[PDB]
Amino acid sequence: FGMQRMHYRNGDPQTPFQIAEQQIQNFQVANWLHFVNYNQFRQVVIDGVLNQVLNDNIRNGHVVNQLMEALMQLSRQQFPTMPVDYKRSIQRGILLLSNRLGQLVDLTRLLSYNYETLMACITMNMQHVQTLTTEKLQLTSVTSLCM
């Protein structure tokens, strides 16, 4: 949108999605930036077991219908000051993903079901706390899952 890049001053309670939300007056993008930051688990018991669950819109693939619109919206942003060589390579790389709507609506429809079915067999509480070490994710593996 031609905005100036921001500095974060690594300290606030506000994530970069949370700052970039009331900064943009676009409906198609700020509908998506409002889901993604208030996207968290829900703490509630069944049968004596406290478990962590999610929204309805991830349990079906309905939130991906907004990720389409928002990603598609900016696939036409003329990108001011950007060189047109690097501009066309990044606007076409988004349509690698936005043109796959029906296959990602069903992928997050399957991911939520396998998480839902396997958590029936949990006996201890699903207590949530930040672990000292961390299992590492590579975003190369996510692009390999999506495409």
Binding site: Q22, H34, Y38, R42, V44, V45, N51, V53, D56
Partner: protein
Amino acid sequence: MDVLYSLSKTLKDARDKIVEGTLYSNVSDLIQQFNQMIITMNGNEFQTGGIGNLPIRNWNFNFGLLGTTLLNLDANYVETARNTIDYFVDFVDNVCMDEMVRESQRNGIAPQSDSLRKLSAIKFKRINFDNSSEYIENWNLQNRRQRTGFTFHKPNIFPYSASFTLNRSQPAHDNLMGTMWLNAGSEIQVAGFDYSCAINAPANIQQFEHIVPLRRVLTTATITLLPDAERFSFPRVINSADGATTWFFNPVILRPNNVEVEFLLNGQIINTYQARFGTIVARNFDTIRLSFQLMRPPNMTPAVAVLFPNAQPFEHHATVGLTLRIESAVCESVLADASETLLANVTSVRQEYAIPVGPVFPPGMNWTDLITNYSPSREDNLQRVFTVASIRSMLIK
């Protein structure tokens, strides 16, 4: 304003649908609305009250979402949601009382309180829910300039008025002629009298007329017409016009002859009815014109003929009257009626917190003084306050 109704609609449904033991699929779409209320409202802070004896309270929202993982709701899930609903329903009471108490003269249709001005941002528009009530539907149709309509049962369209008119008089007050009337609520009782009983009138017929103009245009009314004024039927003593002396009125009652009721709109006769009593309709009108006449009976038994002599001492005075009553009608502006209590909720808030007299409304919210001079500046304020009083009635009776 549209998001203040949308807060109250899904707090009413949250106390009704989230009950113990119910199936989860019954409330699967309400919880997606109720969680999306909370996400919008967190982090904000509000302030209500300050005028009169209405106390100042500060509001702050930091709540957690509801669980979406049970099959049947249990008593843990109900009791953890009731202590969230009870904080919101206390917030909406103090915003609705903050708005029914304030008024402006330039543009009364705009929000006046500090909290309702802050809720009118585009940040809070995602709380918007269905608008199915009568007053919030007419709030939206009238905001786009489309035709609206409110349905009333016995609407208070007439201001209180009880007076008379003497078309023939003298200081002795023993040979009089004219009409008397009572206009109050939704009922007209007019009665014409003549002491001589048309002994010297041409063809022994005396003509009467009574014209009542309205303040707003009514549509599709159901009107009951009966040929007697029961209020002007007994002997009474009445003061003079300037309160100097008193005069006596001893009636006997004939039947009304040649009755014509007309229903006018910009001087054009829309409907007319000639000697037709009972229930009648009136499709579009703003002026009622009653017409009726007294006729001396040409044949009289000896018990009747003593009552009406030719000479001056008239001890039994002739009287002819009618009675009209509006049962139900459809207007376009807000009014008061006999079924709903929206006027009583507005005055009870102002009387309780000792609110000073402002620039628009009459002192004490007097309905006789408010329908008498029913200006377009008072109409925009009265709709804005009856609509807020309708939102508060869903949560707190």
